[PDB]
Amino acid sequence: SGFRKMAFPSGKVEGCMVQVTCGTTTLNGLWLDDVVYCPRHVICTSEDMLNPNYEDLLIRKSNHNFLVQAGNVQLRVIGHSMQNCVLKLKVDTANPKTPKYKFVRIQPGQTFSVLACYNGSPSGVYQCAMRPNFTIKGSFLNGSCGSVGFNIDYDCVSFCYMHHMELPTGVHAGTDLEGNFYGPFVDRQTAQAAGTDTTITVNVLAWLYAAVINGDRWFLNRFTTTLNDFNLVAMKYNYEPLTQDHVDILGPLSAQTGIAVLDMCASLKELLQNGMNGRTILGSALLEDEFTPFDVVRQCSGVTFQ
Amino acid sequence: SGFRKMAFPSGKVEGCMVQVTCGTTTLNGLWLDDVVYCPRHVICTSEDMLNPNYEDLLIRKSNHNFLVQAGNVQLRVIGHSMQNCVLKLKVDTANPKTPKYKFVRIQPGQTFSVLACYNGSPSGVYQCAMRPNFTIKGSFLNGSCGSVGFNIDYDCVSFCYMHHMELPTGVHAGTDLEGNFYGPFVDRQTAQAAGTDTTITVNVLAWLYAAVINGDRWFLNRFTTTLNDFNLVAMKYNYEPLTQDHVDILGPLSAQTGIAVLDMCASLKELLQNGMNGRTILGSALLEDEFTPFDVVRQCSGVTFQ
Ligand SMILES: *[C@@](O)(c1nc(-c2ccccc2)cs1)[C@H](C[C@@H]1CCNC1=O)NC(=O)[C@@H]1Cc2ccccc2CN1C(=O)[C@@H](NC(=O)C(F)(F)F)C(C)(C)C
Ligand SMILES: *[C@@](O)(c1nc(-c2ccccc2)cs1)[C@H](C[C@@H]1CCNC1=O)NC(=O)[C@@H]1Cc2ccccc2CN1C(=O)[C@@H](NC(=O)C(F)(F)F)C(C)(C)C
């Protein structure tokens, strides 16, 4: 029993974190085999924020202008290249702690664990979601750039995020591990801001299923809804449209609980229209949207990782 | 910016988790140097739940009745002893991944990270608090016994919890790493239940300070209170008494924000009497009590671990 915002065990990622310095600028890098991946703005100074020409800044650098430190060991850089908004630094030593890994680009609504790091050293781990507006509500300070987000499947670390920017509302923007930003964001100091965000409907439904699995039914009702009528209500409350693909993805949770997906949609419709009336669900007074259907199955079934 | 329920990086603990089997019973153990620590009920069957005599059950076992598996390597047990509610199994191999560590017994209101494990394999990590009633609101299923809770300081893992039991309300009971239960709980199937719980006042105040550090002041007011008058209100709302020691512990957060502790108490008094009026604090519609003053300083200052 119980239901927590649970992150993946972080050890496999901790063994990959290093510190990268170019001049007076320092941030984190990810060391896999003989390559260190880091944000390309490591080559910027405070004077290179408004419109850096990264190609022109980088051509002026040599391999020896990059210092990479793994724990208390210096790794010599023997090559470098820029890919989108990341820099790949070839080093003289393959990381002996490299896990089985992949790079993946996630869709909005998917969750991942963040290992927040400073100066190449891990500080903490937490779970979060790619918002529909392609920001993440992270917890990051100066020097966290290059911290990564990931999921683990069996024994394989799937890296999905590398941290770059904080936006004016205090939320965060970053890239996949190939250096492509999520959303419209750029690595320059422009007036860019988070767009309007929405609530991740399929995830709210997954979490209502979690609540039923854990023994709570107070919020259910005797009604059903059509998918189209539900989405008319969802739109009014700034919820993402629920697609037939989402309904299919909720199939396993529906089967385990005996509550049809559209019946759970009718429960959610009533919670949106009426509120919770002083009650809580899984310890929250708000409808939680940072658990995916897979996250619920994983945590209610005790899945482990090799 | 941002503020998340952040756990410690778990790698140092992952390297210590093993599987212990006695007969058909399996659970997790913690392997440090040449000793494996696990719950003593590994020696119980389903028929030994109502009132096991652990001394009589254990004297009937030999070292070879215990199977310890680290990954896919068997560790031979060469001695055993019972200490309180834990069993210490001496094994033929010292764990080469043993971190710097301590055992500590925590006070109610202190937080820690849990590495939930099944069959010796880590599944996830989350943060939680020792409640005033000496339960934890964990997320644990059959087979999670022997999972541990911990804090990290510099390079030292301080283990503070080992999981044993689930109570009827779905909360959890366990021991320190010397095998002494927190609270009045026992490792037998009796009618024991969680006592009435209270909210951890000093932690709510710490989290209001976190909210101010991150740029939100909506809930402040122009009033102050005496400590005694605040505690009269706290008692009515089922909050723990605030002591002068707690006021002292909040000193650093008070100094950083310029808000006197008793002024923050007057803010909290008004939030208890009036509610939030549809507003949120750090993304929550409830007053959060599972961050300590140290947790706030750690997360707002970017402390890392060696
Ligand atoms: C990340 O740790 C690091 N950034 C640097 C850096 C910054 C400027 C020049 C050279 C090197 C070294 S470490 C940091 C994390 C961020 C700070 C506060 N919380 C965070 O999550 N990232 C930045 O400071 C980025 C990097 C960057 C690249 C190119 C141009 C400008 C910047 C500044 N920056 C920002 O996040 C700024 N945000 C914006 O400009 C935005 F809103 F996105 F448009 C700001 C205003 C410094 C937070
Ligand atoms: C823990 O993973 C494991 N328990 C065993 C075990 C159980 C009985 C006999 C032999 C071995 C192997 S692994 C498990 C975790 C717990 C289950 C559900 N969620 C959880 O967190 N712990 C138990 O099942 C404990 C162990 C125990 C020891 C001695 C006597 C009885 C038990 C049963 N037990 C309980 O937690 C029970 N709870 C109570 O009896 C209580 F409410 F505390 F009084 C129950 C009813 C099985 C959950």
Side-chain angles (χ1 to χ4, degrees):
Chain A
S1 303
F3 200 75
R4 283 280 182 180
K5 194 55 75 60
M6 188 183 285
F8 289 98
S10 59
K12 287 178 174 56
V13 180
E14 294 168 47
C16 301
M17 297 310 310
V18 302
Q19 180 175 214
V20 182
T21 302
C22 189
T24 61
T25 300
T26 305
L27 49 53
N28 306 283
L30 185 71
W31 179 26
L32 299 170
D33 299 314
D34 63 347
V35 177
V36 173
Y37 305 79
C38 73
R40 70 178 176 166
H41 66 269
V42 72
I43 70 179
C44 291
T45 74
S46 49
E47 291 295 309
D48 300 322
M49 295 174 65
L50 294 177
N51 200 8
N53 190 291
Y54 288 97
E55 290 85 358
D56 194 75
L57 290 172
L58 183 60
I59 199 74
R60 303 170 188 261
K61 301 302 194 198
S62 309
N63 288 330
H64 60 261
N65 293 138
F66 298 94
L67 299 172
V68 177
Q69 195 174 332
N72 290 278
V73 172
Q74 291 297 140
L75 311 178
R76 187 172 121 256
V77 174
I78 62 172
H80 61 268
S81 64
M82 186 165 50
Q83 179 181 16
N84 306 310
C85 303
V86 292
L87 178 63
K88 299 187 273 194
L89 303 175
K90 196 151 175 253
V91 291
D92 59 0
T93 305
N95 183 357
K97 302 179 183 228
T98 299
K100 186 177 180 165
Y101 74 95
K102 279 72 207 141
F103 294 169
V104 305
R105 181 175 180 79
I106 60 173
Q107 290 283 340
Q110 299 294 297
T111 57
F112 58 96
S113 300
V114 170
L115 181 68
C117 299
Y118 298 87
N119 302 290
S121 295
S123 177
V125 65
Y126 54 87
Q127 194 79 346
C128 68
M130 184 58 62
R131 303 302 312 171
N133 70 0
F134 287 107
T135 68
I136 74 175
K137 303 184 332 314
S139 182
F140 282 130
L141 309 166
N142 183 47
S144 54
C145 285
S147 292
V148 298
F150 62 97
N151 286 87
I152 303 177
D153 301 79
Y154 281 101
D155 58 331
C156 182
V157 179
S158 289
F159 294 102
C160 60
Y161 179 84
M162 177 165 277
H163 186 49
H164 299 238
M165 316 288 291
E166 183 167 293
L167 296 168
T169 48
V171 303
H172 299 105
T175 65
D176 65 28
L177 266 293
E178 298 179 1
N180 304 292
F181 269 88
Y182 292 99
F185 308 111
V186 293
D187 54 352
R188 45 172 307 216
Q189 181 167 33
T190 73
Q192 61 189 331
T196 56
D197 203 23
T198 52
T199 301
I200 308 157
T201 308
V202 64
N203 288 3
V204 175
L205 293 164
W207 170 86
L208 293 177
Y209 282 110
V212 175
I213 293 171
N214 286 18
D216 200 0
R217 296 176 57 102
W218 71 258
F219 46 84
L220 300 180
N221 63 40
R222 69 174 177 91
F223 301 106
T224 198
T225 180
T226 66
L227 188 55
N228 265 60
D229 285 340
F230 173 75
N231 279 328
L232 290 172
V233 178
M235 179 177 288
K236 288 290 135 290
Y237 289 90
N238 204 37
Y239 272 54
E240 280 289 285
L242 192 71
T243 66
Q244 181 62 223
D245 197 58
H246 294 145
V247 173
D248 294 343
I249 293 164
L250 292 162
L253 288 169
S254 177
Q256 185 186 333
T257 59
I259 300 168
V261 176
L262 292 170
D263 293 356
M264 193 65 88
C265 287
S267 173
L268 173 56
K269 181 190 297 181
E270 183 171 273
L271 287 169
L272 292 173
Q273 296 173 155
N274 296 358
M276 284 195 193
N277 195 236
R279 303 210 52 169
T280 60
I281 301 178
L282 291 171
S284 176
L286 298 174
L287 300 175
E288 170 72 54
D289 78 344
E290 302 192 350
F291 296 99
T292 66
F294 177 99
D295 295 335
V296 174
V297 174
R298 167 203 169 216
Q299 194 179 156
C300 300
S301 73
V303 171
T304 56
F305 306 93
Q306 187 56 281
Chain B
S1 303
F3 200 75
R4 283 280 182 180
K5 194 55 75 60
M6 188 183 285
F8 289 98
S10 59
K12 287 178 174 56
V13 180
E14 294 168 47
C16 301
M17 297 310 310
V18 302
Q19 180 175 214
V20 182
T21 302
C22 189
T24 61
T25 300
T26 305
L27 49 53
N28 306 283
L30 185 71
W31 179 26
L32 299 170
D33 299 314
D34 63 347
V35 177
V36 173
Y37 305 79
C38 73
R40 70 178 176 166
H41 66 269
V42 72
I43 70 179
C44 291
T45 74
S46 49
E47 291 295 309
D48 300 322
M49 295 174 65
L50 294 177
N51 200 8
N53 190 291
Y54 288 97
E55 290 85 358
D56 194 75
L57 290 172
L58 183 60
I59 199 74
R60 303 170 188 261
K61 301 302 194 198
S62 309
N63 288 330
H64 60 261
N65 293 138
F66 298 94
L67 299 172
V68 177
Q69 195 174 332
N72 290 278
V73 172
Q74 291 297 140
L75 311 178
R76 187 172 121 256
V77 174
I78 62 172
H80 61 268
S81 64
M82 186 165 50
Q83 179 181 16
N84 306 310
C85 303
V86 292
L87 178 63
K88 299 187 273 194
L89 303 175
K90 196 151 175 253
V91 291
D92 59 0
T93 305
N95 183 357
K97 302 179 183 228
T98 299
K100 186 177 180 165
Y101 74 95
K102 279 72 207 141
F103 294 169
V104 305
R105 181 175 180 79
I106 60 173
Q107 290 283 340
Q110 299 294 297
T111 57
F112 58 96
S113 300
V114 170
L115 181 68
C117 299
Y118 298 87
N119 302 290
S121 295
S123 177
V125 65
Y126 54 87
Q127 194 79 346
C128 68
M130 184 58 62
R131 303 302 312 171
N133 70 0
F134 287 107
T135 68
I136 74 175
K137 303 184 332 314
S139 182
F140 282 130
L141 309 166
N142 183 47
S144 54
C145 285
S147 292
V148 298
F150 62 97
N151 286 87
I152 303 177
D153 301 79
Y154 281 101
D155 58 331
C156 182
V157 179
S158 289
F159 294 102
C160 60
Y161 179 84
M162 177 165 277
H163 186 49
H164 299 238
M165 316 288 291
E166 183 167 293
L167 296 168
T169 48
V171 303
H172 299 105
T175 65
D176 65 28
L177 266 293
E178 298 179 1
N180 304 292
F181 269 88
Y182 292 99
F185 308 111
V186 293
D187 54 352
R188 45 172 307 216
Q189 181 167 33
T190 73
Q192 61 189 331
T196 56
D197 203 23
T198 52
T199 301
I200 308 157
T201 308
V202 64
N203 288 3
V204 175
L205 293 164
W207 170 86
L208 293 177
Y209 282 110
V212 175
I213 293 171
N214 286 18
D216 200 0
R217 296 176 57 102
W218 71 258
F219 46 84
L220 300 180
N221 63 40
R222 69 174 177 91
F223 301 106
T224 198
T225 180
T226 66
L227 188 55
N228 265 60
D229 285 340
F230 173 75
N231 279 328
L232 290 172
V233 178
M235 179 177 288
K236 288 290 135 290
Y237 289 90
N238 204 37
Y239 272 54
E240 280 289 285
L242 192 71
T243 66
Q244 181 62 223
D245 197 58
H246 294 145
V247 173
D248 294 343
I249 293 164
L250 292 162
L253 288 169
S254 177
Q256 185 186 333
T257 59
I259 300 168
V261 176
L262 292 170
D263 293 356
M264 193 65 88
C265 287
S267 173
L268 173 56
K269 181 190 297 181
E270 183 171 273
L271 287 169
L272 292 173
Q273 296 173 155
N274 296 358
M276 284 195 193
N277 195 236
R279 303 210 52 169
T280 60
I281 301 178
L282 291 171
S284 176
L286 298 174
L287 300 175
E288 170 72 54
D289 78 344
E290 302 192 350
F291 296 99
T292 66
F294 177 99
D295 295 335
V296 174
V297 174
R298 167 203 169 216
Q299 194 179 156
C300 300
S301 73
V303 171
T304 56
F305 306 93
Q306 187 56 281

